[PDB]
């Protein structure tokens with residue numbers, strides 16, 4: 001037999017929010033995980049700064 | 063094949079390509095310009111006719127669904143390149159009877175190519191309406207090659223004729239009146255096949 | 267004989283599937299495809315980089331319990 | 345004065361009435377700065393192409409003059425012209441879907457004639473070859489023109 | 501009305517908190533000094549193990565007022581050398597195609613991942629530009645060399 | 657005879673090469689199977705309407721134990737007969753190997769594919785299944801060393817090809 005063990009589901013509030021915006025049901029699962037903090041709201045990020053943060057590294061290595 | 067001007071070198075390259083076509087991934091065949099190069103650069107050259115037609119026969123024997131426009135263009139281009147070297151008004155019987163070995167080998171290879179491609183992709187050729195004339199001309203070539211007095215060539219043509227007759231019969235085994243859609247295509251040329259069978263009947 | 271496997275979708279989504287070592291993998295495939303109202307043909311599945319055939323079995327690749335499977339969406343250009 | 349009237353609804357006979365003036369009247373009237381108008385003029389001229397000896401010669405000389413004036417312009421990218429020509433004939437798709445043409449016999453014959461002229465760049469041959477050997481329903485309708493064009497392309 | 505802005509803001513929040521490694525999806529600030537959610541500037545890393553590897557390609561993205569009803573227009577800037585990218589840079593993708601595989605569920609992250617997976621999987625059967633398709637069919641290793649050269653040019 | 661041609665007779669073991677040559681040489685049919693060791697060279701002479709034609713037939717050994725200088729027997733050969741057995745499918749499955757060995761030494765020579773033992777009712781290699789000669793442009797004949805069916809057709813075809821006279825015929829003298 002082949003069966004399913006578990007399937008993640010976010011909070012019902014996020015379920016309703018995703019329904020409102022027609023987003024995937026599991027869209028908000030990121031913020032429901034551990035090591036989550038308040039939502040910083042500045043978004044003072046330009047493309048140049050985002051490129052700089054990469055520091056020329058964009059590929060993981062084993 | 064695209065820069066060399068040395069006849070033996072290019073002939074050797076084609077001879078090896080003929081062997082590579084047995085196993086190479088189909089991506090190297092239908093997703094490049096191999097078919098067009100074979101049809102236009104080497105098929106018309108007298109010293110490259112036979113090997114190029116052998117390569118085209120190997121390509122035509124591939125039965126796959128992912129590539130069907132390449133088979134369609136493998137047929138129209140080949141036929142257009144074939145009526146500029148073997149005119150439809152040629153008496154292949156007499157010409158073959160007194161001809162060089164290269165020409166006889168070409169006639170046998172042409173019978174093999176037509177038989178293989180028709181047996182494989184007759185459905186594809188029939189589906190397209192604007193390709194009706196090309197299909198009729200291919201059948202005319204098959205009828206012309208059926209007159210050659212060579213047992214092997216006649217067997218090659220006869221297997222295709224038997225295939226077509228069996229297919230048409232299995233479509234509808236009743237005499238013509240409506241008519242089945244696929245039988246209407248071959249009506250103008252079925253009496254020619256009947257005449258050929260009556261004229262060259264073998265000893266029982 | 268019966269082990270759990272981790273499938274990571276392209277939506278930061280993780281799902282645990284219980285499967286045998288001999289049963290065909292395609293059974294799981296369709297499930298993950300119908301999770302988001304998607305047909306089978308849309309999604310693509312990768313395990314250890316290479317592609318996983320529908321009828322393949324974990325026995326050939328020896329997929330241990332809780333192993334990581336990545337799912338990609340194959341794009342069709344125009 | 346009637347060049348525009350002919351261009352509105354081109355017809356094989358209307359081209360003849362212009363006489364030898366058609367050689368330069370078409371070239372002069374057409375705005376060759378923008379390749380789109382050059383391609384439109386080329387298609388309109390070649391749409392009335394016919395195997396009749398008198399008509400074909402007029403069409404071919406008009407096309408030669410139009411491209412000679414078009415290709416001798418620094419502010420005129422040849423690749424843009426080729427891409428637009430392929431788009432209009434339906435051999436290629438476009439960001440904004442411009443409706444294709446029905447018959448490619450005339451355009452293909454005009455291209456075959458053009459490929460054999462000097463002003464035609466030797467760099468656009470591979471693109472035309474690739475998109476003419478490219479399978480397409482609109483091409484299999486005119487097999488003879490396609491085959492002649494392919495032979496001409498493989499010559500160069 | 502506010503559905504578009506709310507969805508864009510929420511997905512930007514999600515991207516800031518959670519996004520794939522190597523991607524950038526920065527919404528360009530409006531000139532007055534406030535966020536302009538309509539226009540986004542994104543960066544896609546060439547998938548590792550492929551000739552596109554070792555490069556980060558920019559991509560502008562424009563949304564409509566009816567989003568997510570209609571898909572966004574994605575344009576590489578400057579245009580890339582890909583069979584399925586138009587000369588103007590617009591990316592031809594079925595997912596981005598309005599009438600083929602468009603669903604409001606798809607988000608910016610999934611669009612970018614699909615574009616990344618498109619780079620190594622060109623659809624040459626229906627090409628979007630002539631130069632890339634011609635080079636791809638004529639000689640494949642030349643196409644790979646060109647891709648590597650541009651990736652080095654576009655390297656961080 | 658002054659006009660001499662070298663014929664190479666290849667094929668699996670027990671297919672009937674030695675019996676086929678002996679019937680022409682003396683007209684007697686051999687019923688016992690004695691494997692050929694290496695090669696045996698036999699001169700056959702036919703009388704065509706254009707004069708005598710001589711084949712120096714090199715009848716080789718089809719068993720791997722008795723191969724000898726196998727591909728060294730094909731040097732300077734001018735015609736070939738590849739013989740298989742219609743009562744044995746394995747013999748027909750090995751024709752490609754014999755043809756490969758033959759054409760790796762003799763690039764362009766006339767080749768006849770002979771299917772022997774067609775007088776036996778239990779035929780395993782049916783006529784429809786013999787399609788190897790087509791893409792290789794070889795001749796094909798169903799023969800029988802026991803019944804003399806199509807007995808001289810292989811040699812007649814080879815003589816027509818080598819001499820270059822399509823209107824050549826054998827006349828007994």
Ligand SMILES: Nc1nc2c(ncn2[C@@H]2O[C@H](COP(=O)(O)OP(=O)(O)OP(=O)(O)O)[C@@H](O)[C@H]2O)c(=O)[nH]1
Nearest residue numbers: 669670672673674675687688689692717718801802
């Ligand atoms: N029924 C029947 N038997 C045949 C025929 N031709 C040959 N044989 C038998 O087949 C056996 C094998 O033939 P041979 O010529 O002796 O063997 P070979 O062809 O020389 O093979 P090798 O010597 O091993 O290389 C002979 O003993 C014959 O009796 C035939 O036409 N009909």
Ligand SMILES: [Mg+2]
Nearest residue numbers: 673674691692
């Ligand atoms: Mg023997």
